[PDB]
């Protein structure tokens, strides 16, 4: 008995990925209890349930919030706790078909392995993004479908993007704001630095398109002059024409959008076993 008793809340999507978690919950509870966590669980039913539960949990003095599901459950949990005093630490159990945030932090795709990471108690702080009044953890993207794989479907649109002091103003096929980058690359992106990865693909002819696509195919897109790469903390986006917004893999409304990177905002259990190339701070 090496620690004083703690309180954990599991927030889980029962129909997530392979859907094995609900069946494995009783053993997850045993393991968490043996490690000293009085553990309770909440099963989501619809989109938004995880956010609302995380909001309630804020008032219930938990040491850890465990999100068991895909990037959607994760995004929802973060939305419920972001910018609130006394945030619990976040535990990630990757129960989605894709788990881009998990892979970004090297969380095992094995339940008991992910639980081993939480129980061991080493954690990192990662940036999150604020967009208008909501939050995100992976990426935001924007463009207009005609009348990187999707670039040939984009229509040039006039846009302005104020990023920190600077201004881009012109026609663009696509913009990306990346936090994590394993959904894929810029060469030197950090989860830690307080900077979004900002990609803007400018309006280009068919040849520049072919070219950008063949460079993309071997991690060299950033080398094309029509591909802009900047790092920025605050990015404000507007146009007079209407754009669709993708936020963490889902439709996230439309413009205008104001983005702020909340540097090292969220404390999340991570492996002390392995070195993260995308972290400035590996003090864990």
Convert 227-254 to b/e letters by CB count within 10 Å (16 or more is b): bbbbbbbebbbebeeebebbbbbeebee
Q: Tell me whether strands 37-43 and 6-12 are parallel, antiparallel or unpaired.
A: parallel
- Evaluate the omega torsion of the peptide bond into residue 240 and state whether it is cis, within 30 degrees of 0: no
| CATH, residue 19 | 3.40.50.10330
Question: Same domain, yes or no, for 114 and 135?
Answer: no
Residues 6+ apart with CB under 8 A from 132: 257, 258
Question: Same domain, yes or no, for 133 and 259?
Answer: yes
Question: Same domain, yes or no, for 95 and 157?
Answer: no
- What CA–CA distance (Å, rounded) separates 252 from 242? 13
Q: Provide the greatest CA pair distance for the chain.
A: 66
Using DSSP, state whether 99 is helix, strand or coil: coil
Question: Same domain, yes or no, for 30 and 116?
Answer: yes
Question: Same domain, yes or no, for 238 and 275?
Answer: no
What are 103's two structure tokens?
A: 């892979």
Using DSSP, state whether 106 is helix, strand or coil: coil
Instruction: Annotate 115-162 with three-state secondary structure.
Output: HHHHHHCCEEEEEEEEECCEEECCEEEEECECCCCCHHHECCEEEEEE
Q: Tell me whether residue 222 is annotated as binding.
A: no
Q: Tell me whether residue 76 is annotated as binding.
A: yes
Q: Domain tally for the chain?
A: 2
Residues classed as catalytic = 250
Asked if 258 contacts 131 with a C-beta cutoff of 8 angstroms, the reply is: yes
- What CA–CA distance (Å, rounded) separates 8 from 139? 28
What was the experiment behind these coordinates? X-ray
Look at residues 223, 233, 183 and name the one whose alpha carbon lies nearest to residue 201.
Answer: 223
Question: Same domain, yes or no, for 275 and 253?
Answer: no
- What CA–CA distance (Å, rounded) separates 200 from 172? 7
State the DSSP code for 110.
S
Whole domain around residue 193: which residue ranges? 129-264
Question: Same domain, yes or no, for 180 and 211?
Answer: yes
Q: Which helix (H) or strand (E) holds 39?
A: strand 37-43
Q: Tell me whether residue 190 is annotated as binding.
A: yes
Question: Same domain, yes or no, for 102 and 149?
Answer: no
- What CA–CA distance (Å, rounded) separates 284 from 18? 31
Convert 36-69 to b/e letters by CB count within 10 Å (16 or more is b): bbebebbbbeeeebbbebbeebbeeebebbbbbb
What are the E-state strand segments in 165-256?
166-178, 196-202, 227-232, 234-238, 244-247, 250-254
Question: Same domain, yes or no, for 41 and 122?
Answer: yes
- What CA–CA distance (Å, rounded) separates 197 from 188? 9
Q: Tell me whether residue 233 is annotated as binding.
A: no
In sequence order, the β-bridge partners of residue 212 are none
- Cα-Cα-Cα-Cα dihedral sign, residues 273, 279, 282, 283: negative
Question: Same domain, yes or no, for 196 and 271?
Answer: no
Asked if 231 contacts 166 with a C-beta cutoff of 8 angstroms, the reply is: no
Question: Same domain, yes or no, for 17 and 69?
Answer: yes
Look at residues 200, 193, 198, 191 and name the one whose alpha carbon lies nearest to residue 172.
Answer: 200
Instruction: Residue 256: count other Cβ atoms within 10 Å of its Cβ.
Output: 11
State the DSSP code for 277.
T
Instruction: Annotate 5-38 with three-state secondary structure.
Output: CEEEEEEECCCCCCCCHHHHHHHHHHHHHHCCEE
Backbone angles phi, psi at 144, to 5 degrees: -130, 125
Question: Same domain, yes or no, for 133 and 114?
Answer: no
Q: Which helix (H) or strand (E) holds 71?
A: helix 71-81
């Amino acid at each position: 008995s090496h620690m004083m008793r703690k309180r954990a809340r599991i927030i889980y999507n029962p129909t997530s990925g392979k859907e094995q978690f609900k069946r494995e919950l009783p053993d997850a509870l045993i393991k968490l209890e043996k490690a000293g966590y009085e553990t309770s669980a909440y099963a989501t039913e619809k989109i938004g349930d995880a956010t609302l539960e995380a909001e309630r949990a804020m008032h219930e003095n938990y040491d850890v919030l465990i999100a068991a599901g895909g990037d959607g459950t994760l995004n929802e949990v973060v939305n419920g706790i972001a910018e609130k005093p006394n945030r619990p630490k976040l535990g990630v159990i990757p129960m989605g078909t894709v788990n881009d945030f998990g892979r970004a932090l090297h969380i095992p795709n094995d339940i008991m392995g992910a639980l081993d990471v939480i129980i061991e108690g080493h954690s990192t702080k990662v940036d999150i993004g604020k967009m208008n009044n909501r939050y995100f953890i992976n990426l935001a993207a924007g463009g207009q479908l005609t009348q990187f794989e999707m670039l040939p479907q984009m229509k040039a649109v006039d846009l302005r993007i104020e990023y920190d002091g600077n201004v881009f103003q012109g026609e663009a096929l696509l913009f990306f704001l990346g936090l994590t980058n394993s959904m894929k690359l810029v060469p030197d992106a950090k989860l830690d630095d307080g900077y979004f990865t900002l990609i803007i693909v400018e309006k280009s002819n068919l040849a520049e398109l072919g070219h950008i696509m063949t460079l993309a195919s071997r991690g060299e897109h950033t080398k094309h002059p029509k591909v802009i790469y900047e790092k920025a903390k605050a990015i404000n986006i507007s146009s007079f024409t209407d754009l669709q917004l993708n936020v963490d893999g889902e439709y996230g409304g439309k413009l205008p959008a104001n983005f702020l990177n909340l540097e090292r905002h969220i404390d999340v259990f991570a492996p002390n076993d392995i070195v993260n190339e995308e972290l400035i701070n590996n003090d864990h």
